Structure formats: structure tokens, C-alpha cells
């Protein structure tokens, strides 16, 4: 409808408040260190970010 009810329902928390910054998905989010990255996109940029595998 009009601007008053097109986005009426609040989204201050929950999965609806936070989405992935890369693939724009609300599942598998890694909020540790405020990554806000998709569970698979995190591995995609793992080398670029600097997370190495040691053990």
C-alpha cells in the first residue's frame, strides 16, 4: 500500500533484521566479529580476508 504500511512491521532484531552482506541471504550468517557473511561466502573470501588453516 502506501508508505505507512508497505514496511510497517518492525525489524529491529531476529533473522529479518540481519542479512548477508555478500549473497543477501538470511541463513548461515556468521555474526562473530561482525562478519555478517554467508556461511559459504566466508570460505569464498577466506584467503582474501586472511584466515589461514593450521589445525
Amino acid at each position: 500500500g502506501h508508505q505507512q504500511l508497505y514496511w510497517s512491521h518492525p525489524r529491529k532484531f531476529g533473522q529479518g533484521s540481519r542479512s548477508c552482506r555478500v549473497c543477501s541471504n538470511r541463513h548461515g550468517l556468521i555474526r562473530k566479529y561482525g562478519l555478517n557473511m554467508c556461511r559459504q561466502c566466508f570460505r569464498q573470501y577466506a584467503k582474501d580476508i586472511g584466515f589461514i588453516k593450521l589445525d
Binding site: I30, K32, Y33, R39, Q40, F42, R43, A46, G50, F51, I52, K53, L54, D55
Partner: protein, 104 residues
């Protein structure tokens, strides 16, 4: 002026962090500054465990991602003025440097 300056360095590779430590304190040693030793702060290990598969089928295998953060503190406390003598930074990529007066 009379000043005391605390310098802290933080990077991801210890080799270039020990190099940026070495050359800065070495120049002060020639410039007659009283340099406290490099304070090796405990290394912050940023570990994240993430499921390898994107779909959830398999033998339930994970992935352990380590990220090492090393901090070293160097104190440049000579009784005389220090700020004008040290103007260069001569820093390298991968490190973050910091200047702070001992007041705060």
C-alpha cells in the same frame, strides 16, 4: 619540551612485525633515545569453525580458521623533546601503527 610517547604495532606476520620493530628502535639507538624493550603482548588467535559443505550432506567435516594478531609495544621515553626528532614512519603493508602520548 618534555614528552613520553608510547608506540604500539600490530600486524599479522611476525617477520615484518619484527622488522618494523627492529628498524624503528635501531634509529632511536643512534639518535640517543631511551627505548624500553618490545613488550610482546599475548597473541590474539581469532578462530572460527565453519562447516565445509554448503548443503549439509557428508561425514560432518568442519574447517578451523586461525588468524594471528601480534601486538608489540615500544616506549620512546627520553627526557628531552622527541616529536620533532622522529618525523618519518617508514612503515610497510600489513601493519597498523599508533602514536599516543603517555598522558592518555
Amino acid at each position: 619540551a618534555i614528552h613520553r610517547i608510547r608506540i604500539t604495532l600490530t600486524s599479522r606476520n611476525v617477520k615484518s612485525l619484527e622488522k618494523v620493530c627492529a628498524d624503528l628502535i635501531r634509529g632511536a639507538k643512534e639518535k640517543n633515545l631511551k627505548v624500553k624493550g618490545p613488550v610482546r603482548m599475548p597473541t590474539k588467535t581469532l578462530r572460527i569453525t565453519t562447516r565445509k559443505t554448503p548443503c549439509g550432506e557428508g561425514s560432518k567435516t568442519w574447517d578451523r580458521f586461525q588468524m594471528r594478531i601480534h601486538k608489540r609495544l615500544i616506549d620512546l621515553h627520553s627526557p628531552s623533546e622527541i616529536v620533532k626528532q622522529i618525523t618519518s614512519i617508514s612503515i610497510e603493508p600489513g601493519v597498523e601503527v599508533e602514536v599516543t602520548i603517555a598522558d592518555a
